[PDB]
Amino acid sequence: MKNSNDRIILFRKAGEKVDATKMLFLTEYGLSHEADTDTEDTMDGSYNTGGSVESTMSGTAKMFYGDDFADEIEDAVVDRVLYEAWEVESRIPGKNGDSAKFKAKYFQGFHNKFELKAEANGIDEYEYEYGVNGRFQRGFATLPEAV
């Protein structure tokens, strides 16, 4: 029942505490959690190994003139700086004193890939893959500029 465009997605570098921003012109966004469980056989039975889970998210968006954020991303993938991101679902506020902040998932990791693309007579689109680097925390977060 949630229209995808309700999902809002923010990033920022850990070092820049003050800095804040949002990703714009998403077309397709996809999160993923991949459990590595390969059971190794046993004579008396079988055991299901509990392996790490490399969660990652891939999003594609457009690239316009009044923004350079995507350039910061294609910088980070190379410089391999840390970032942290916020997958906040709007229209879902707090419960007691957190109404201004809506539910979200917070996770800190690196951008594992940047790939943009051009097409004669068309707007260029940049895709990015971000590795979450561990457990993703839950709670609520506040948007900037009321949008």
């Binding site: 007691n96 109404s99 201004a100 500029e145």
Partner: protein
């Protein structure tokens, strides 16, 4: 205790276009004296201290169906509790409940001496209808409890001044009685 003192809303005293917010607070019609709004004020990011001595705070309240022939609106003081932490509470009145539906609110402070005031959020609020009803308070009520209590307290202060000026004649009798009782207590032990 039994009362709806669980809610709490934060009022950001900052000039950054703090928009209206649906606080998601839905009291009911047949609720008297137990509907309470816990306000917590914040200056920039941390709580703003307050006091009934320096400043005086009030809140305005207005239903959404407010008309001249039918509506609801009031403006009344607060009940500061844990002021240093910027916390306070408002006991919802009894006549206002009879009017159901959406509601808008507001909390404004006035700094004594200068009368320079401050307005925080203009937040939203809800009130629902129950089955204990049938009496219709369609008559729109608009009373400025602030100035009303002001005049009532001025009258009461005049009356208390009168009673004290009357008692001024009894103070000598009090002195004499106290001295006599002291002398008696001495002579006893």
């Amino acid at each position: 205790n039994f009362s709806k003192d669980d809610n709490l809303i934060e009022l950001q005293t900052t000039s950054q276009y703090n928009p209206v917010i649906d606080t998601n607070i839905s009291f009911y019609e047949s609720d008297r004296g137990t509907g309470v709004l816990n306000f917590a004020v914040t200056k920039n990011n941390r709580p703003l201290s307050i006091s009934s001595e320096h400043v005086k705070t009030f809140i305005v309240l207005k239903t959404d169906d407010y008309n001249v022939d039918r509506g609801a609106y009031i403006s009344d003081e607060l009940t500061i509790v844990d002021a240093i932490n910027g916390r306070l509470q408002y006991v919802i009145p009894n006549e206002f409940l009879k009017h159901s539906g959406k509601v808008h609110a507001q909390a404004f402070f006035t700094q004594n001496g200068s009368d320079n005031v401050v307005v925080e959020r203009q937040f939203s609020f809800n009130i629902e209808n129950d089955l204990v009803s049938g009496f219709d308070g369609i008559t729109k009520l608009v009373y400025i409890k602030s100035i009303q209590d002001t005049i009532e307290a001025v009258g009461k202060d005049f009356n208390q001044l009168k009673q004290n000026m009357a008692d001024t004649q009894t103070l000598i009798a009090k002195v004499n009685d106290s001295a006599t009782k002291g002398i008696q207590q001495i002579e006893i032990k």
